[PDB]
Structures are given as structure tokens and as C-alpha cells.
Amino acid sequence: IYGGQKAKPGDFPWQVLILGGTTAAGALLYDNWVLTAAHAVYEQKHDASALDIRMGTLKRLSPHYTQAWSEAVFIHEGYTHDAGFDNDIALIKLNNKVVINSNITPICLPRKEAESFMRTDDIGTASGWGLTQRGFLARNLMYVDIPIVDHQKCTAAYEKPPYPRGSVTANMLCAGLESGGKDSCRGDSGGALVFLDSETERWFVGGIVSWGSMNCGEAGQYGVYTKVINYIPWIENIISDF
Amino acid sequence: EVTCEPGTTFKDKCNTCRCGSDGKSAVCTKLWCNQ
Amino acid sequence: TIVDCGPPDDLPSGRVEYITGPGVTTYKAVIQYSCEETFYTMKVNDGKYVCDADGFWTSSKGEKSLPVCEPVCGLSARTTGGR
């Protein structure tokens, strides 16, 4: 995370670390599923080792975490690894239910009228252990509050030469400031971009950290996140079909 | 910090990128490649 | 001498109480399941089970399965509303 500050205990109890050849993230749903990006779990399909999922800690290198393991991984069928960033979403079934506590609690899925809390300029929050402006992975879980960007502003920014056109779809949302600075960065992939439902006072996931410029926090680009509300039937059918 | 073929999707170590129209830029996924 | 459903199984993230009397597991006896408060909600039924003629503890909707204690999502320690 760029331009953020340290999480406190219990701020992001859904946040999970997924540690392998990469450092990446997800968000707990219920007690036995993790929501993440497809790109973050693709390369592991043919690995002998299950995904190493770590919950309940602020410190990246905590020896003190709650261990989970993948049992099954469901990558969206519309994800095409070698052709763009569309449909960047995946569900991980854990081998056992985790016991909930103040540091381990699932994020809510967006309700039907969640878009009312995800309007242009509404503030969402990205959290993670990814690259900070120190130039290293964060030792401590960080977060940043950033606004949802008008979808056509975001699309226009990623059409300005030399960016590759046609990268931003209807299944994505963008968050950040036009000036740059505050952003999600390498290592933050798969984390939940969350929003407050002020009627229930409960937090929900609107986005999954997906992609952006190679240089995070650059002016003229915005972090791009999978738009979770477009996947609710897919999510539901995976967690039923199971 | 990159050289690539315009429009293509390509790997930058563990990340997936789409190359810019100048061949000297890209947009990429946000994994931290431990290697 | 009478149908016996036996001691009921435990409810993960929950608890079970004998309502008819202590350790009473026989025909028409009543138990009550509950989930841990605040952080979980019970989903499928009201958790009142009866020892049925068929010898199974059976919910008020005729289900033999346990209730499910579902964690309450989206609770956070973050302050809101500018505080």
C-alpha cells in the first residue's frame, strides 16, 4: 500500500495472507471460504502444495497466525490468463472452518443496493502488506482510504498513450486520486477493497485488488479492482454447488 | 523499467502485464514475486 | 421400553440444553440449541428439537440436521463517522 497507515487490531479481520512463490492476499467469507483474484491463484493449480493461508495477524512475518489450507480453488471460467485482466476473481475452499474472533471475521458480500455506498467519490479502503514507499513489503498491515473513480474517467485515463487500450471493462472499478499517491501495490493483490454500509454499520467487499500501472501511485492512472457486485450469482453458485 | 511488444499480454516474472503502445511501459497485476 | 433418541450431538459455535429434564433423551423429550451470542446467528431453524417417533432428534420443520451457526460478517474495530 502507498500512502497509507498501519492497521490496528480488529480493523480488517477478513484480511488473509497467501504465501508461496508470491506474496499476495485474500478476504475471508463465512468461516471456510477465501475470496481472492484469479491471477493470484492461477500458477498454483498444478502445485503439490496447497495454498498457505494465514489469518489473524497484523505482522506479515508473524510466527502467531492462524493457519488455513486450500482444499479446492475455483477460478472464474471467464478468466483468460494470457489475454487481459477481465473476470479476475477466484474462490478458495478451506480444508476446515476457522473459529471467528476479533482478528478473524469474514467480510460481507455486497447486497442488492450496495451500489448506493459505492458511488463516484465514495471512500473505499484497500488493506495489505504490499510494497510501501520505504521500497519493501510492509512489516505491518497497512490501509489507505481512496475514492471510487468515475468509470468513464478511469477508462479515459487508461486510453491515454502509451497505456494499452481496452484494458478496463464493465467488471472493473477504479479507486484512487487523479494526482496519484495513495494506491494498492505489488503484494496487495487479492485483497478486499471495502466499503461501509452506514445503514447496518457493517463492512462489505466492493473490489478485489487486481492491476494498475507497473509503477504504483503514479499520477494519470488508478488502481483497478474486480467489481465484486457483478459476480454475486457466480459466488453463490460456487458456494452452493460445492 | 520494462521493454515489451505493443498490445500483447506477457509475463513480468510472476505478474501478468499488458504492454503499452511505446513498448517501454506496461500495466500489470499486483503480486509480489518473492523471486 | 420406549423410543430413545440418545444424547444429542453438539453444535459447533453453539450449545445444547435439555428442556424436558436433565439427560432426558426419550420419545417426545425436548432440547434447545443456541449459537454463541453476538458474533454468530443461527440460520436454518429456531433450534428446538424433539425426540421423534422415528428415533431422531427433529427440528420444528422436520429436519434431522443440526442448525448452523453462521458468523456475523463485516464487524470491524475501525471508528466511523469521523470519530
UniProtKB/Swiss-Prot annotation, chain B:
Residues 1-26 form the Pacifastin domain. It comes from the Eukaryota. Disulfide bonds join C4-C19. In vitro, is active against alpha-chymotrypsin and pancreatic elastase. This is Protease inhibitor SGPI-2. It comes from Schistocerca gregaria. The chain holds residues 57 to 82 of 92 of the full protein.
UniProtKB/Swiss-Prot annotation, chain C:
Disulfide bonds join C5-C51, C35-C69. Changing R83Q: Abolishes autocatalytic cleavage. Residues 3-71 form the Sushi domain. It comes from Homo sapiens (Human). The gene is MASP2. The lineage of its organism: Eukaryota, Metazoa, Chordata, Craniata, Vertebrata. The chain holds residues 363 to 444 of 686 of the full protein. This is Mannan-binding lectin serine protease 2 A chain.
